[PDB]
Design a protein around this ligand. Sequence first.
Ligand SMILES: Cc1ncc(COP(=O)(O)O)c(/C=N/[C@@H](CS)C(=O)O)c1O
Length: 382
Amino acid sequence: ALADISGYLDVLDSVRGFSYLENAREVLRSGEARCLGNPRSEPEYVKALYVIGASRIPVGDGCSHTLEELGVFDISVPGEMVFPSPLDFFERGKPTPLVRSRLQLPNGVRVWLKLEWYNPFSLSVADRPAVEIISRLSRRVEKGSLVADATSSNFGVALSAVARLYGYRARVYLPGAAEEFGKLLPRLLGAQVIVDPEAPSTVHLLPRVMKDSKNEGFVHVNQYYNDANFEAHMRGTAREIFVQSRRGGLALRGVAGSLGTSGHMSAAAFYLQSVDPSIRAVLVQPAQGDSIPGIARVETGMLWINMLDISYTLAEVTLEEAMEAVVEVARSDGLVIGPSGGAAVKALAKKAAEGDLEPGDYVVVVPDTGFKYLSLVQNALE
Ligand SMILES: Cc1ncc(COP(=O)(O)O)c(/C=N/[C@@H](CS)C(=O)O)c1O
């Protein structure tokens, strides 16, 4: 028997840890789930179902239900694209587009681009964790409380818009080296913004944010460590790649992406590799000395990409190389991607060149629009 998952979403405030993901893998890999006689005695199972994008839960004595029955494959989007509010637009106006590129890689490696700038608040993938985190927050923390974090830019914008849509106040802390959209836009959206000229990276701002949190009593929402960030991309970004691939007729052989907190590619890889363990995750390691905005090297500390049981390969990519690739996707497809998108295109293009990859369809996740990166555009032309 099928019941609504919404009623049972207190498990989000009660399950901790990662042992619950064993349930996900089996349900995904099997393509079904066992009915629970007492949904409340199985909090691990129930959470797993939500995290894979189920909308309903299987309830009763001895039965099972498929992914389709559970609502993993439910179409959310109104065909007419009419939405009664922006937050409902983020939620229901999904998936983000999967576009097959005219870009041609060797060895029958077909490039598809998942355009995460089709998120309404930050025009970037960071919307998805921002809505998930703040939505759980709305359960506990009283309205008018100040919520805050460090960001390279996107999340700070996403946090500021979404905070204020939930009655919360926002503060964002940014490195001096972040772009002007990051420093400026949260202010337009009603946040405070703090820029540390001496912080060379977003991770290095973390102690300052924790220190001030202890002093002032704001809720440091902590995108690096907040399990909602991984979970949002499990039921959103990754699930979409699962569903789109299948509805698309794709022979999905891998994913390619970039790492900041590591939330989105950990989710894609884990979810996809639950379904089919051979699926490669090709991940970018920005080259040493170089800065690619929004992303970083793994060894600077990332929660999920280490701890979860995820097969991935790395490819080294310089800024200059991420910028070359922006330029060529612009000339191939007329679509203007961000630095970190080009980095992932490049990264896959190398594994493809090397002979390391099967022929078939790969999905790259493109985190944002290149329209926010005029300097790096300018410098890559001259
Ligand atoms: C342009 C762009 N590309 C990739 C990512 C990497 O995504 P995750 O690995 O975080 O899912 C991000 C996330 N950026 C975080 C900074 S670590 C933020 O906006 O504060 C980004 O903004």
